[PDB]
Curated annotation (Swiss-Prot), chain F:
Tissue expression per record: Highest in the pyramidal and dentate granule cell layers of the hippocampus.
Protein name, entry field: Glutamate receptor ionotropic, delta-1
Job description of the protein: Member of the ionotropic glutamate receptor family, which plays a crucial role in synaptic organization and signal transduction in the central nervous system. Although it shares structural features with ionotropic glutamate receptors, does not bind glutamate as a primary ligand. Instead, forms trans-synaptic adhesion complexes with presynaptic neurexins and cerebellins, regulating NMDA and AMPA receptor activity and influencing synaptic plasticity through signal transduction. In the presence of NRX1B-CBLN1, forms cation-selective channels that are proposed to be gated by glycine and D-serine.
Encoding gene (name): Grid1
Subunit: Homodimer. Interacts (via extracellular N-terminal domain) with CBLN1 (via C1q domain), and more weakly with CBLN2; the interactions mediate the trans-synaptic adhesion complexes also with neurexins and are required for ligand-gated cation channel activity.
Residues spanning the membrane: 10-29
Parent-record interval covered: 629 to 675 of 1009
Localization, UniProt: Postsynaptic cell membrane
Length: 208, 94, 117, 46, 91, 41
C-alpha cells in the first residue's frame, strides 16, 4: 500500500540516471593510424640519422614560414636525447631497428614496397610521405654537349608512359599485399546455456 | 618537340590538373548500422517461442537483452561527432 | 571563361590549372566552389630559352636554389596564399508512414474474406 | 652544391629514408564505467 | 483480436520521434563572441575611411607572410565594393 | 478520469526529453579557469 513505495519511484529516476550514464560512454567514437598529421602526435620516427633527410629537415622544419605542421613535429620526435634510439652508424641500423620497437619512418614508397612486399608481415605498412621538392635526379658534368640528347629520352618515356611500364616491370604496384557490430552474440548463447542450466535441472530434479 | 631543336630551363612547377566543382533524409541514421542484425533479432523471437514448451528466466533474458538494442539505436545519433560528397576522379565518372 | 559559368551552370567538372581555380576561389564573394588535389612531380614545368645560351645552367642554378631555399614557394604564396577567400528532417513524414499501410489495407481484406466465409 | 659545379638532368621521383627489415564490440560502455555497479543492483535486490 | 496487428506504430516511430527530439538538442553545441575572427561571419560591417585604422591595417590585411589571417579576413570583409562595402566617412 | 491523464503522459514525455541535454553538460566541457583573480582562492 504505502509501505511498498520507497525504493519504487526511487528506481523511477535512478535507473534513468544510469541509462543516461551508460549512454554517453562512446559518443566521440608499421601501421597504427591512417593520416600523416595524425602521426605527428604519436611515437617518434625511425629515419636514417645523418642523412640528407636528417639534414634538410633540420634546415626546413626549423623554417617556420616553410613549416606545414608536420616537419617541426617530425623534428621534435626525431631529436630525442640528441637522436638517441634513432641511432644510425651503418645505414641498415635504423632501417632494421623498430619493427617491434614501434617507431615508423619510410623511404619513397618504391624502395619501401620493394622491401615490405618482399616480407611476410604486411603490418609494416606505414603510409606515404615524401619530399615534394627533393629526390633523385640524373647527374652529368658541365660542358659535355649531351644533355638535350638525353633529356629528350627522359621526357619521352613518360610521354609514352613507358617510364611507367619500366617501373612496373621490376616493380609492380600490385604484389601479394594489394593495399562495434557483434556485441550481442558475445553474450547471446550464454543465455541458451543458462536455459540449459535452469530448465534441464528442473526436469532432472523432477525426475529425481 | 619543344626539345627537338629548342630547350627549356629547369622546373619551376610540376605536373597537375585541376577539377572545378561549384557549390534520403531520415533513412541515413539506420545506415551506420549493419542491416543484417535486424533479422538476427527477428529470428531470435522464434527461439524464445520455443520456450512455450521458469518463465522468469526468459523475461530476465530479455530485460538484459534488448537493453543494448535500445542503446544501439541511441548510439547512431552522433553522426558528426568524432557541393561534393566523393573525391575520386573515378568515383565521379558515374 | 566559358568554363567559368558552364561549370557554374551545368554539372561540369573541369580540366584546367588548379592555380587559376585557386585564384577564382580567391575572387568569388561567396565560398561556393570545390577543388580536388593533384600530385604528379615526376613531370615538371621549366622555362624555354634560346637554343644556345651561356648561362643556361646558371639560370637553372637559381631555379634550383630558390626552390632549395623555398622562396620560390614564398613567391607562390604572394599572389595565392594557402587560406584564400574560400575556406572550401521536418519533412520525413510519409516515409515510415507508408510502410504499414500495406497491412492497414490488408486488415479489412482478411476480415471480409473470412467474415464472408 | 653538386649542380653548381657538375651539371644535372631532370628529376624522376621524390625521397625519404626510413625503417625496412622484417626482424571488442560493446565494451566501450565500461571504459568510463566501474563494473561493480551491476552487482550493486544485484545486491540491492534482496 | 487485432491488438497485435497495428500496435507496432505507437512503439517504434514514437521512439524515432524521441530520437529527433533528442539529437537536435545535443547538436546545439549584445556580445556573441569576443573575437575579431569569430564575428567575421557577421555582415554589414561599419568602418571609417581615410583613417589610420583604414590605412595601416590594409597594409596588415595584406602581406601574406603575416600568418594571422584574421587581419586579412577582416581586410577582405570590407575590401570589396572598392573598400566601400558598408562604410562611413567619419566616426 | 481521462483528462488529467493528459497531464500524466505529457510529463512522462516532457521531463525525460527535458532530462536530455544536461548529459552534454556532463559530457563536453589540465586547466578549467583562466582569471588572475579566480586562481587567487
Amino acid at each position: 500500500a504505502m509501505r511498498i513505495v520507497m525504493g519504487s519511484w526511487w528506481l523511477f529516476t535512478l535507473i534513468v540516471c544510469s541509462s543516461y550514464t551508460a549512454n554517453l560512454a562512446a559518443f566521440l567514437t608499421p601501421v597504427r593510424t591512417f593520416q600523416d598529421l595524425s602521426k605527428q602526435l604519436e611515437m617518434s620516427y625511425g629515419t636514417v640519422r645523418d642523412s640528407a633527410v636528417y639534414e634538410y629537415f633540420r634546415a626546413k622544419g626549423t623554417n617556420p614560414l616553410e613549416q606545414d605542421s608536420t616537419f617541426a613535429e617530425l623534428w621534435r620526435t626525431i631529436s630525442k636525447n640528441g637522436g638517441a634510439d634513432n641511432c644510425v652508424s651503418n645505414p641498415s641500423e635504423g632501417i632494421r631497428k623498430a619493427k617491434k620497437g614501434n617507431y615508423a619512418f619510410l623511404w619513397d614508397v618504391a624502395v619501401v614496397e620493394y622491401a615490405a612486399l618482399t616480407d611476410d608481415d604486411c603490418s609494416v605498412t606505414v603510409i606515404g610521405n615524401s619530399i615534394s621538392s627533393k629526390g633523385y635526379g640524373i647527374a652529368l658534368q658541365h660542358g659535355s654537349p649531351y644533355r638535350d640528347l638525353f633529356s629528350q629520352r627522359i621526357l619521352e618515356l613518360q610521354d609514352t608512359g613507358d617510364l611507367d611500364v619500366l617501373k612496373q616491370k621490376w616493380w609492380p604496384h600490385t604484389g601479394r599485399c594489394d593495399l562495434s557490430f557483434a556485441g550481442v552474440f558475445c553474450i547471446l548463447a550464454i543465455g541458451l546455456l543458462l536455459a540449459c542450466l535452469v530448465a534441464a535441472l528442473e526436469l532432472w530434479w523432477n525426475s529425481n | 618537340e619543344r626539345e627537338s631543336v629548342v630547350d627549356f630551363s629547369k622546373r619551376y612547377m610540376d605536373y597537375s590538373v585541376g577539377i572545378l566543382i561549384k557549390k534520403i533524409s531520415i533513412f541515413s541514421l539506420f545506415a551506420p548500422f549493419d542491416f543484417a542484425v535486424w533479422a538476427c533479432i527477428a529470428a531470435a523471437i522464434p527461439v524464445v517461442g520455443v520456450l512455450i514448451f521458469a518463465m522468469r528466466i526468459v523475461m530476465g533474458s530479455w530485460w538484459l537483452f534488448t537493453l543494448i538494442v535500445c542503446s544501439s539505436y541511441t548510439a547512431n545519433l552522433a553522426a558528426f561527432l568524432t557541393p561534393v560528397r566523393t573525391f575520386q576522379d573515378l568515383s565521379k565518372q558515374l
